[PDB]
């Protein structure tokens, strides 16, 4: 059926796009910094050691 | 109601991350400072230094 | 006011500078608060007119 | 920015949306037509 | 059933939430005041009709 | 501070774009149905005479 | 008790078009400006912060 | 996504600045022939 | 001098593009309403009775 008030498929797609965005940002960050660990988000116990 | 519930949680999480990321950054600098302080201390253990050094 | 060569005047000028820094912070917060009030009214008006229509 | 604001201000005084007037116009056209059908029918009787 | 009283009500609750995380902020407090005014406005406006 | 300022200030273009599409389709469809609506009095005039 | 004449159905339609028009205006404005928060109408607390 | 603020670009610029400082230090020391080129390097060592 | 002269000389591309579009739409509307406007006497007369 065609509902015009809400293109459900659009939101479905947008979520996956954001999903990708996060990983691309992570990869570019790591590649730039030269480190696997940049922030505590990366690896806590590893950060400590 | 449930949608508004989720929206409120979204706002809360935005503010929380706002605080926490900054805290992490400043603590990273703190860690570097402590490392270099330790480094200095070892220098002090050297017994060939005169007083002005 | 020139300060070079002098003391007192350098520190007096610094005091006034810090005073103004503080004052600008406070004034900025006040203006932003008034803007917030106006924004709330501005948003409310549209809902009211849709109600009326 | 002030000029844009005042521009939009002026429109509200003097302009009019087309949908409103058009909608009224077509209807009133039809109303006039039925009104004149009144005259047609009464005249047709008038011959008696 | 989109702008009816409930819609404004949850919006007031939303503003109250946003205040809960910025307790010192004057702007948020003013915003909450305004949202309360709007809420009472809708209440009384409907009661007028009835 | 730049990141936080961004999350508060900026716009998400995909969201507004899909909103745009929604609005455009609504507007065209509604003008069509309005034309047919304004004809409805014509339907009843043809009914009337 | 009918609105063949007042149309009603037509006025009604029109109001829905106004809603769509406002949505389109907001979407266009935001997408051109690059900021979600363009005025105090967008938010109070957001403006301040 | 956001059009007008490339946060990741800023981050990469910061990393570039890090590497740049390290590079400058390496070149300076390499050219001088001395590890302690100024008071910044090893203050008490410089005095000694 | 070249920039200063430009500001006195030149015509703003976007502004006049929009003006031209508005003018075409206005003239189209005017012509259609004119067709119906000349119809007006035509209608009132054709109903001769």
UniProtKB/Swiss-Prot annotation, chain E:
It is found in: Secreted; Bacterial flagellum. It comes from the Bacteria. Belongs to the flagella basal body rod proteins family. This is Flagellar hook-associated protein 1. The chain holds residues 102 to 151 of 553 of the full protein.
